[PDB]
Structures are given as C-alpha cells and as structure tokens.
Amino acid sequence: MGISWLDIYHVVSATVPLYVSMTLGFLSARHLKLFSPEQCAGINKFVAKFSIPLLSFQIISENNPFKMSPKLILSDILQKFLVVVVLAMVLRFWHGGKLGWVITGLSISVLPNTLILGMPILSAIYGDEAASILEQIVVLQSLIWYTILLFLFELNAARAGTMKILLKAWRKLIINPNTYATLIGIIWATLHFRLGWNLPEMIDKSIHLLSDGGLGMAMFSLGLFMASQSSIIACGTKMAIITMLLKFVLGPALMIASAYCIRLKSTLFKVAILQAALPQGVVPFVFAKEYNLHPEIISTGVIFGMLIALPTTLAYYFLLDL
Amino acid sequence: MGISWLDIYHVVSATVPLYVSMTLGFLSARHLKLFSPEQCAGINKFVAKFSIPLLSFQIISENNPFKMSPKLILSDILQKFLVVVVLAMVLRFWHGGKLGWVITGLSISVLPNTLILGMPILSAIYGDEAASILEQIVVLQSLIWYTILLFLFELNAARAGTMKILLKAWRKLIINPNTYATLIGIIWATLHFRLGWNLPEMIDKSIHLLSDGGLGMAMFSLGLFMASQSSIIACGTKMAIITMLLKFVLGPALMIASAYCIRLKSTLFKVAILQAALPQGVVPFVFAKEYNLHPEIISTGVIFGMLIALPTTLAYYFLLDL
Numbered sequence: 062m063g064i065s066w067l068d069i070y071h072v073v074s075a076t077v078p079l080y081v082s083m084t085l086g087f088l089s090a091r092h093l094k095l096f097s098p099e100q101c102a103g104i105n106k107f108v109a110k111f112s113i114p115l116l117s118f119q120i121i122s123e124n125n126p127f128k129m130s131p132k133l134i135l136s137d138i139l140q141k142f143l144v145v146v147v148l149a150m151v152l153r154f155w156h157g158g159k160l161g162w163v164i165t166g167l168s169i170s171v172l173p174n175t176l177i178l179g180m181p182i183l184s185a186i187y188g189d190e191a192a193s194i195l196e197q198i199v200v201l202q203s204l205i206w207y208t209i210l211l212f213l214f215e216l217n218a219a220r221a222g223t224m225k226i227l228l229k230a231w232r233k234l235i236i237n238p239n240t241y242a243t244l245i246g247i248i249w250a251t252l253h254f255r256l257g258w259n260l261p262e263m264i265d266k267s268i269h270l271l272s273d274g275g276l277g278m279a280m281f282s283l284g285l286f287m288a289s290q291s292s293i294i295a296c297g298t299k300m301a302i303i304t305m306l307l308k309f310v311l312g313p314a315l316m317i318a319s320a321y322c323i324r325l326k327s328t329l330f331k332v333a334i335l336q337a338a339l340p341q342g343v344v345p346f347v348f349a350k351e352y353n354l355h356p357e358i359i360s361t362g363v364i365f366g367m368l369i370a371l372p373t374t375l376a377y378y379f380l381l382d383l
Numbered sequence: 384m385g386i387s388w389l390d391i392y393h394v395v396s397a398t399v400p401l402y403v404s405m406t407l408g409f410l411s412a413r414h415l416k417l418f419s420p421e422q423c424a425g426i427n428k429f430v431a432k433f434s435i436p437l438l439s440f441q442i443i444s445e446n447n448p449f450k451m452s453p454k455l456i457l458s459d460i461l462q463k464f465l466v467v468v469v470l471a472m473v474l475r476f477w478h479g480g481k482l483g484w485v486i487t488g489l490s491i492s493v494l495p496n497t498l499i500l501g502m503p504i505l506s507a508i509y510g511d512e513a514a515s516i517l518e519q520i521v522v523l524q525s526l527i528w529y530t531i532l533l534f535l536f537e538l539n540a541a542r543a544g545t546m547k548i549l550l551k552a553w554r555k556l557i558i559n560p561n562t563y564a565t566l567i568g569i570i571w572a573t574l575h576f577r578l579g580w581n582l583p584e585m586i587d588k589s590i591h592l593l594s595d596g597g598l599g600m601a602m603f604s605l606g607l608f609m610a611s612q613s614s615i616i617a618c619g620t621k622m623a624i625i626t627m628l629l630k631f632v633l634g635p636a637l638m639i640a641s642a643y644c645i646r647l648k649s650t651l652f653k654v655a656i657l658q659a660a661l662p663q664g665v666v667p668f669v670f671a672k673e674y675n676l677h678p679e680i681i682s683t684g685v686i687f688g689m690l691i692a693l694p695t696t697l698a699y700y701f702l703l704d705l
C-alpha cells in the first residue's frame with residue numbers, strides 16, 4: 062500500500078522539529094514573556110531580510126537552469142494562472158480591499174511547503190524519481206512566485222494616477238533584497254552550470270553561516286505570532302475551514318487540471334499533483350506578517366496544514382494509483 | 384618564516400565569514416536603518432536565550448567526560464585562578480565597581496575563541512591532536528566557565544548583605560537557560576558515552592534547526608551593537624590597549640606560567656598555550672550586552688583581535704617552538 066510503518070515515521074520526524082520551534086517561540090512570547098511585540102517584529106524582519114533571501118539564493122544557485130523540464134514549468138504556471146482566475150471570479154460574485162484576499166488566497170493555495178515537508182514524503186512514496194522534480198518546483202517557486210508575491214505585496218501596500226502606484230511598487234521592489242538574491246542566484250546558476258565556475262569557499266561558508274537557521278527562526282517567529290492571538294484558530298472556524306479547502310481541495314484540483322491540460326505522462330504527473338496538497342509553508346506567512354496582510358489566516362492555515370498533511374497526502378496517493 | 388602559505392589562507396577563510404556577518408549587521412543597523420534599538424536588543428536576547436544554550440548543549444553532548452585530560456583541566460583552572468588573583472590585585476592598588484571590572488577582565492583575558500577561530504588554525508598548524516585538545520577546552524569553557532561568568536553577572540546585577548545577595552544570584556541562575564543546557568548536556572554525555580543511549584533524530588534535528596545559525600546571529604548582534612556606538616574604537620585609546628595587552632600579553636603569559644606549574648609536556652604544552660592567545664569569543668560579549676556591563680570594551684577587543692589573531696598566534700608558535 063506504500064503506507065508501511067517506517068515511512069510515515071520519516072514524515073513525522075521531518076515535521077516534528079518545525080513544531081518544536083513553533084512551541085518554543087509561542088512559550089517564549091506567551092508564558093515566559095521574553096519578546097515584546099517590537100522585538101518579535103524585529104526577529105521577523107531579520108528572517109525576511111536575511112534568512113529567506115539567502116536561502117532563496119542558495120536554492121536557485123544549486124540547480125541547473127538548462128535541465129528543468131519545460132512541461133513542469135508550464136504546468137506550474139498554468140496552475141497559478143487558473144487559481145488566480147478562480148479567485149478573481151469568486152471575489153467578484155462574493156466577498157473594499159479585493160487585492161488583499163487574492164494575495165492571501167494565492168499564499169495559502171498554490172505555495173506548498175515543498176522545501177522541507179515535501180522532500181521526505183514524496184521522495185519515500187516514489188523514491189529518487191520524485192527527489193529531482195521537487196527541486197525544479199522549489200527553485201521555480203522561490204524565484205518566480207516569491208518575486209511576484211513580493212511585487213503584489215508592494216503594490217497593495219502602495220495602494221493605501223494609476224502608473225504612480227505601480228512605479229512606487231516597482232521602486233520598492235528593486236530595493237527588496239529578495240529580488241537581488243533571486244537575480245544573482247539565477248545568474249550564478251547559469252555561470253556555474255555552463256562555464257563550470259565554482260563559488261569561492263569563503264562566500265559559500267559566509268552564506269551558510271548567516272542563513273542556516275532560517276527555517277528554525279522562521280518557525281520561531283511563527284510561534285511568536287500565535288502568542289499574540291486569542292485562540293490557535295485566530296481567523297475563526299468558518300475561515301479556517303475555507304483556508305483548508307483552498308489548500309487541500311482547490312490547489313490540488315487546479316494542479317490536476319493543469320497536469321491534464323499539459324498531458325503529463327510519467328511520474329511527473331503524480332508527483333506534480335501530489336506536491337500541491339502539501340503543507341502551506343512559512344515564507345508566505347513571513348511576508349504577510351512583514352507587510353501585515355492577514356497574517357492570522359496564513360499562520361492558522363500553516364499549523365493545521367502541517368497537522369493534517371499526512372492523511373490528505375496518503376488519500377491523494379491512494380487516489381492517484383487508482 | 385617557515386609556516387606553509389596554505390595555513391594563512393585557512394585562517395583568512397575561517398575568519399572572513401565572521402567579519403562578513405558583522406559588517407552586514409553594522410550596515411543594517413547604521414546605513415540601512417532596518418532595526419531599531421529595541422529590535423536589536425530582541426535579536427541579541429534571542430541569540431543569548433536560545434542559540435548559545437543549545438550550542439553549548441551540543442558541544443557538551445558530543446564530548447566524552449571519561450577521556451578528558453586531568454592535566455589540561457588543572458592547567459585551565461589554574462590559569463583562571465592566577466588571572467583572578469592578578470586582576471583583583473591590580474584593581475586593588477590601581478584602577479563602575481570592582482566586581483564589574485573583574486568580570487570584564489575575566490571575559491577579555493581568559494575566555495578566548497576556540498570553537499571557530501581555534502580549530503582550523505591550531506589544527507592546521509600543529510596536527511590532529513590539537514583538535515581534540517581544543518574540543519576538551521571548549522567543553523570545559525561552555526560547561527563551567529560560562530556558568531561561573533553568568534553567576535558573577537547575576538551577582539553584579541544584584542549588587543548594583545552577602546548571604547541574601549548570593550541567594551538571589553543563585554535563584555536567578557537556576558532559571559537561566561545556560562545552566563539547564565549545560566546541566567542536561569553533561570548528564571546526556573555521561574548517559575550516551577557510558578550506556579550507548581543515542582539521541583533520537585527527532586530531537587537532534589530540532590536542536591540543530593534552532594542552533595545552526597547561532598554563531599551567525601551572534602556576529603550579527605555584535606555588528607548591530609557596534610553600529611549602536613559612534614566610532615569603531617568606542618572605548619578610546621587607553622581602553623583598547625589595556626584590553627588587548629590582557630588578552631595577548633597576559634592571557635597567554637599566565638597560561639605559560641600555569642603550563643610550567645602543571646608541567647605540561649609534548650604537544651599539550653603548546654596547544655594549551657597557543658589556544659589562549661586567540662581572539663575573544665562573542666558569547667562573553669552577548670552576555671555583557673544582555674546585562675549591559677561595559678559591552679564597548681568587549682566589542683572593541685573582539686573586532687581588533689581577529690585581525691591580529693594570525694600575527695600573534697604565529698609569533699607564539701615561533702617563540703614557544705624552540
């Protein structure tokens with residue numbers, strides 16, 4: 062069946078540390094009362110300005126741009142376009158600030174946590190044939206989709222003529238370290254994998270020194286933020302259910318539609334579909350907190366996702382084989 | 384001059400990442416204005432409360448108490464006794480508070496940086512045994528000397544009769560994260576090296592996620608604090624010389640005296656002496672900044688010692704080697 066009992070344990074081992082960090086952050090902010098809200102904001106700003114950009118640079122620079130499969134990229138782009146279209150259509154009939162929910166909808170719908178909790182799960186269920194397609198997904202995710210998400214965040218922030226707002230958002234984006242990180246990362250990937258240049262050991266050691274606890278500190282900030290809320294389900298039960306349906310019932314459905322449209326055939330099809338039902342991630346939450354765009358919804362989604370990501374992933378895996 | 388030129392590159396490569404993190408912190412605090420003073424204090428608090436204790440626990444757990452060299456421990460204790468007596472005597476006849484000055488002196492004089500700026504250097508200049516000796520010294524440091532320094536910090540904070548103040552310092556020490564970290568690390572090292580109780584990966588992964596970036600974060604905090612002051616050499620002129628002649632002319636000299644007192648022989652007599660003539664670690668800084676005890680003096684020493692680490696250590700190597 063593939064469930065075994067020595068793989069769903071690998072999943073739990075990969076997931077538990079992210080929970081230990083969140084619990085430590087929450088206890089520190091709530092019961093121990095170490096960090097004031099300003100200090101928590103400073104920690105989150107450090108995560109968003111240094112850890113995340115450096116991790117994105119590493120991810121982009123450690124993958125060959127000339128080996129990425131065009132079909133996978135087309136499928137990912139089509140999924141993102143479809144989710145944008147459906148969210149825009151929904152926000153017209155039902156619901157002021159409409160762009161804010163689009164960013165939130167995209168954050169919790171088409172940005173799975175493929176980096177950490179998507180690697181062991183999928184690598185075990187299908188082997189190494191799924192441990193080289195989830196890096197093509199993660200690199201594309203970081204570069205293209207975090208650049209676009211940051212542009213949308215800046216545009217929304219500037220909103221509160223028309224070319225003035227776009228110009229202001231673009232000007233604030235070029236100063237954003239994430240853009241520089243992604244651009245330098247892709248340039249270095251091209252150079253390394255075409256001309257063979259190797260990064261000097263000093264620079265690699267410096268980057269690995271300053272951006273090694275990025276995931277742990279991100280979880281710490283995410284746990285700090287839930288110390289400032291009244292309940293674990295900050296948004297509410299009704300909104301939490303929608304947050305789950307937007308991540309495990311809509312994202313996977315749009316990914317299946319995109320894969321069918323692109324006609325994915327080999328394990329690419331199943332890995333592409335089953336990686337869209339993965340946990341939500343924390344980078345979207347980090348951005349939401351930094352720009353203060355419905356952080357409660359994102360962070361509430363992250364927890365319950367990471368809880369229920371195993372049963373849903375196994376259900377999708379059983380469905381696919383059928 | 385006989386030292387192989389590759390050693391110089393090893394030292395420079397081991398030292399560059401720390402300077403890079405320091406420069407990034409300084410720029411973010413002073414030139415980019417990313418962090419307010421409260422946010423910098425929060426980052427330093429996070430480093431001191433979650434990164435340093437976990438790193439110390441790791442260091443203690445990955446050492447075997449039953450292979451420790453008694454002569455090395457006696458030499459290390461005798462250095463700190465000699466330094467304590469000499470510092471008290473000099474502060475007695477000549478010269479706030481004496482206890483605070485004693486703490487600063489014992490933080491700038493008998494607490495070098497061995498973990499990072501000692502292994503690649505003293506192991507690439509002497510051999511492989513030096514790595515084990517430095518590991519033992521670092522374990523002694525993080526186990527007993529950091530705890531004693533924290534107790535002294537708490538005593539100074541309380542002072543700023545005797546039994547009541549000592550009791551208050553003890554009460555404030557038992558809850559300190561470092562105390563619990565070291566007291567659990569020693570017990571776990573005993574259990575793991577006497578019974579084979581390997582630490583489950585679910586816990587090692589959590590500890591690493593929350594402690595890998597501890598060193599980079601400490602350097603970043605040092606850079607932020609240095610940005611807080613006006614000039615790079617904040618302490619002045621007679622506090623940047625009487626702070627380095629106690630770390631490179633007294634810290635090593637009293638180790639040389641203690642080595643003859645204990646009669647260290649072979650490589651030990653040299654590794655144990657040249658490890659004392661190394662730059663200051665950032666943990667004593669972190670502590671001083673947390674407790675606000677003349678942090679400028681420690682920061683200046685840390686900044687100016689990493690530059691002369693190679694000249695001074697080389698001079699000691701070519702002097703003792705005779």
Ligand SMILES: CCCCC/C=C/C/C=C\CCCCCCCC(=O)O[C@H](COC(=O)CCCCCCC/C=C/C/C=C/CCCCC)COP(=O)([O-])OCC[N+](C)(C)C
Nearest residue numbers: 092093094432433436437440558559560563564567571586
């Ligand atoms: C068995 C495995 C070990 C598990 C830990 C259990 C230890 C023994 C049991 C209890 C004591 C432990 C208390 C620790 C919590 C901090 C101190 C405290 O106690 O919190 C605080 C003091 O914290 C602090 O400064 C900062 C928090 C430090 C958290 C430490 C996180 C890093 C931990 C590193 C240790 C590494 C351990 C290795 C684990 C792997 C082992 C295999 C005092 O508490 P309070 O009530 O007095 O005031 C608090 C309540 N108010 C605010 C209302 C007065």
Ligand SMILES: CCCCC/C=C\C/C=C\CCCCCCCC(=O)O[C@H](COC(=O)CCCCCCC/C=C/C/C=C/CCCCC)COP(=O)([O-])OCC[N+](C)(C)C
Nearest residue numbers: 110111114115118236237238241242245249263264267403
């Ligand atoms: C030989 C040994 C020594 C070599 C050391 C090598 C690397 C050191 C380590 C990391 C890089 C140092 C940080 C660079 C920051 C650039 C400025 C910036 O990221 O944007 C900064 C903003 O930043 C920040 O807020 C965050 C600061 C932290 C930067 C983190 C960057 C992460 C990206 C890393 C990729 C770099 C890889 C190294 C190169 C490898 C390929 C050759 C904008 O200022 P601006 O001038 O770009 O535009 C400003 C325009 N206006 C003047 C109008 C304002």
Ligand SMILES: O=C(O)COc1ccc(Cl)cc1
Nearest residue numbers: 439496498499525598664665
């Ligand atoms: O981080 C550094 O470079 C200073 O070296 C040490 C770091 C942590 C401990 Cl517990 C002891 C020494």
